[PDB]
């Protein structure tokens, strides 16, 4: 799950997965490009596409066997990124294609913790729907309920129920 450095076509793909050029991603995939090319921080194209919300690319990479559960050097998966930045459709897509709904980064932080913290309520419900352990604790002992108290977002607290 921790992927290593590609080259030329691995670089080209990463750079294009980020900018949202849907054309060029399709070219490079057909021409052999490593779908799990990582960068210096361990971000595959699926990470990059999840972070900058390019849904089309996310489905395309998944069509070509991309690791839905790629880890970056800190334990953080593409679902983490999409959940955190409120990219709903990508969250659906990733969990539909096998994303580990309970993945913990090095800090014990789950996609639920993150969706919770940034108030992304629709995404929180979808994570719960697909198995998300609501009592998952990060390294400081915090659940996503504890998060909802500290933020004082009562909409969330009632969702967690």
């Amino acid at each position: 799950h921790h992927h290593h450095h590609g080259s030329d076509l691995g670089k080209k793909l990463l750079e294009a997965a980020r900018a949202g050029r849907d054309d060029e991603v399709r070219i490079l995939m057909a021409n052999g490009a490593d779908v799990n090319a990582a960068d210096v921080v361990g971000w595959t194209p699926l990470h990059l596409a999840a972070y900058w919300g390019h849904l089309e690319i996310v489905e395309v990479l998944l069509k070509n066997g991309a690791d839905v559960n790629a880890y970056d050097t800190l334990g953080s998966t593409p679902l983490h990124l999409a959940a955190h930045f409120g990219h709903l459709e990508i969250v659906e897509v990733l969990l539909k294609n096998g994303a580990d709904v309970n993945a913990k980064d090095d800090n014990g932080i789950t996609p639920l913790h993150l969706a919770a913290n940034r108030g992304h309520l629709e995404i929180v419900e979808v994570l719960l729907k697909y198995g998300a352990d609501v009592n998952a604790q990060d390294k400081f002992g915090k659940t996503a309920f504890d998060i909802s108290i500290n933020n004082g977002n009562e909409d969330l607290a009632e969702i967690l129920q």
């Binding site: 921080v41 800190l74 090095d106 400081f140």
Partner: protein
């Protein structure tokens, strides 16, 4: 031309956003009541550096603009962070281009790149800077500081932090006012008067090394050399230069607005003639760029790129001139870390000096053909804009309603995508700035810090001092005042895992590692945030396509821009203001 006053300040170890929101915005909000200001633009960089350029109406007296600017900055000085003020803020009226470069080398190679840069900084720069007509002086290198390079394993072993080292350096590299024996007013019959001398500044690595951090309960001594390596080294390490491939330092000199070019360069040479006799053996001045007979070569890599990547591209550039253009090129003065557009790990410049005009006979060996041939030859280089030089439009995309950085980028991109779909009118429509890069976001858990009794100031000082460095106070190096810096030794600040080897001391005296109270993630952020007349902006360059007028292309851009999201405006500047 329209005169320009430039404010420059810095903040050791600060990211762009930090520089922007503690320095740049503050200064910008206080640039009011100044006469004849056409427009104001700024950069805030992840080098911890800000440059604000205030551009005035043509006809404006540059002395007056300068003074008015300096005075406004003076009244804003107390709103800035102490770290910024104590670096010294500069304000300058100069040309953006260099008038000349003064090269310095050691022909006996006795002195490294660093020793030459210090020799230049400590013995040559100030007198050049005080010569009349000299607007701005760029050292291609750094003056020495006393570098205290901390070891986090040894600091933990004796239950110490960077806070303790800093505290101890301020107490034991001190210069004390102690008054006099028989001082005024004195008693009647006093026979003796003499100054009392207490602590003076330290002058050597030896003296810093015996700073006494703490006496253990068993009697033994922990000295600063027990938790740190101690050497003279640059205030920073970002600018390294070569002259025909050998180590060099130098001074890039800019002409003060309105001064004489020729008089100014004679005065400089005369001042250089005064310092030559006192040079150490080996040191020699070389004149690698005199304003044709000269040109430059810019090297811009994409942001994120290290000193090592940029050096490899500069070597190819230097190589081509030293091999393919042997017969026309006398020399190449090449600088890694400074470029046409300011400063970064990912930029560089080469100053090229040609042989005598008379020994370069024929159309093909003149400046125009040489630069053209070189641009052609460097255009193949991968992930580097590399051009050689001696027309278009200048457009600012502007955040008019608090949109923020991420959304103004999306709007930038939406503009560029549309402009690429009209190649008949617009070509080479690009940002002039940089792209967001991965950065390391660390969150201090306040709760956990509090429960363990670890103070946030000790945490943030430990973090900053170790990973960005900290300007503690001054010392005297061979009779010249200079700075003292604590930072981590390179090897304990290179990788994410290294964070967890730094320990902080709690109120109860136990040592607590960073991992106990922090957590971290990667995220994207800007290494260069831009601003135009006080608001966030993004500068876009382009030209009219062939057989199309400048005005029609501008007209197209204005149309294109009207279709951007709510909150995004624009403006013309520089070459496009008229």
């Amino acid at each position: 031309a329209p005169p320009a006053v430039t404010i420059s300040a810095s903040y050791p170890g600060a990211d762009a956003k930090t520089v922007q929101d503690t320095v740049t915005q503050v200064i910008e909000q206080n640039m009011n009541g100044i006469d004849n200001l056409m427009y104001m633009s700024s950069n805030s960089d992840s080098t911890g550096t800000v440059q604000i350029t205030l551009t005035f109406e043509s006809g404006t007296d540059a002395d007056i603009a300068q003074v008015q600017v300096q005075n406004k900055l003076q009244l804003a000085m107390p709103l800035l962070p102490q770290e910024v003020q104590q670096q010294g803020v500069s304000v300058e009226k100069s040309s953006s281009s260099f008038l000349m470069v003064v090269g310095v080398i050691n022909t006996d190679g006795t002195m490294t790149q660093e020793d030459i840069s210090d020799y230049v900084a400590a013995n040559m720069k100030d007198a050049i800077s005080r010569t009349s007509g000299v607007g701005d002086v760029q050292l291609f290198g750094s003056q020495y500081a006393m570098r205290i390079w901390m070891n986090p394993n040894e600091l933990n072993k004796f239950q110490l932090t960077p806070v303790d080292v800093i505290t101890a350096i301020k107490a034991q590299n001190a210069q004390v006012a102690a008054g006099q024996l028989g001082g005024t007013p004195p008693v009647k019959g006093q026979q003796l008067n003499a100054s009392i001398i207490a602590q003076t500044r330290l002058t050597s690595t030896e003296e810093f090394g015996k700073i006494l951090l703490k006496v253990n309960q068993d009697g033994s001594r922990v000295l600063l050399r027990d938790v740190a390596k101690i050497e003279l080294g640059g205030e920073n390490y970002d600018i390294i230069a070569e002259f025909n491939g050998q180590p060099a330092s130098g001074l890039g000199i800019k002409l003060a607005t309105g001064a004489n070019a020729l008089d100014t360069a004679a005065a400089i040479r005369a001042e250089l003639a005064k310092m030559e006799p006192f040079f150490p053996s080996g040191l020699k001045i070389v004149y690698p760029y005199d304003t044709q007979g000269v040109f430059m070569t810019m090297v811009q890599l994409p942001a994120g790129a290290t000193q090592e990547r940029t050096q490899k591209v500069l070597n190819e550039v230097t190589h081509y001139y030293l091999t393919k253009e042997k017969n026309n090129v006398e020399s190449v003065f090449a600088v890694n870390g400074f470029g046409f557009a300011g400063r970064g790990q990912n930029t560089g410049i080469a100053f090229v000096s040609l042989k005598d005009w008379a020994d370069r006979p024929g159309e093909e060996n003149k400046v125009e053909a040489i630069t053209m041939r070189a641009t052609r030859a460097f255009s193949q280089i991968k992930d580097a804009m590399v051009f050689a030089f001696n027309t278009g439009f200048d457009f600012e995309l502007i955040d008019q309603a608090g949109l923020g950085h991420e959304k103004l980028t999306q709007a930038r991109n939406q503009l560029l995508a549309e402009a690429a779909k009209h190649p008949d009118m617009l070509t080479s429509v690009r940002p002039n700035g940089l792209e967001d890069t991965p950065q390391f976001k660390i969150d201090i858990d306040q709760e956990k810090a509090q429960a363990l009794g670890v103070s946030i100031n000790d945490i943030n000082t430990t973090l900053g001092a170790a990973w960005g460095g900290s300007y503690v106070n001054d010392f005297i190096d061979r009779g010249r005042v200079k700075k003292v810096y604590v930072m981590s030794e390179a090897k304990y600040r290179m990788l994410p895992d290294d964070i967890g080897d730094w320990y902080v001391r709690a109120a109860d005296g136990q040592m607590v590692p960073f991992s106990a109270f922090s957590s971290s993630r990667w995220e994207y952020g800007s290494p260069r945030l831009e601003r135009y007349n006080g608001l966030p902006s993004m500068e876009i360059l382009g030209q009219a396509a062939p057989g199309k007028s400048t005005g029609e292309a501008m007209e197209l851009m204005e149309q294109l821009a009207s279709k951007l999201p709510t909150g995004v405006g624009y403006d013309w500047t520089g070459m496009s203001y008229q």
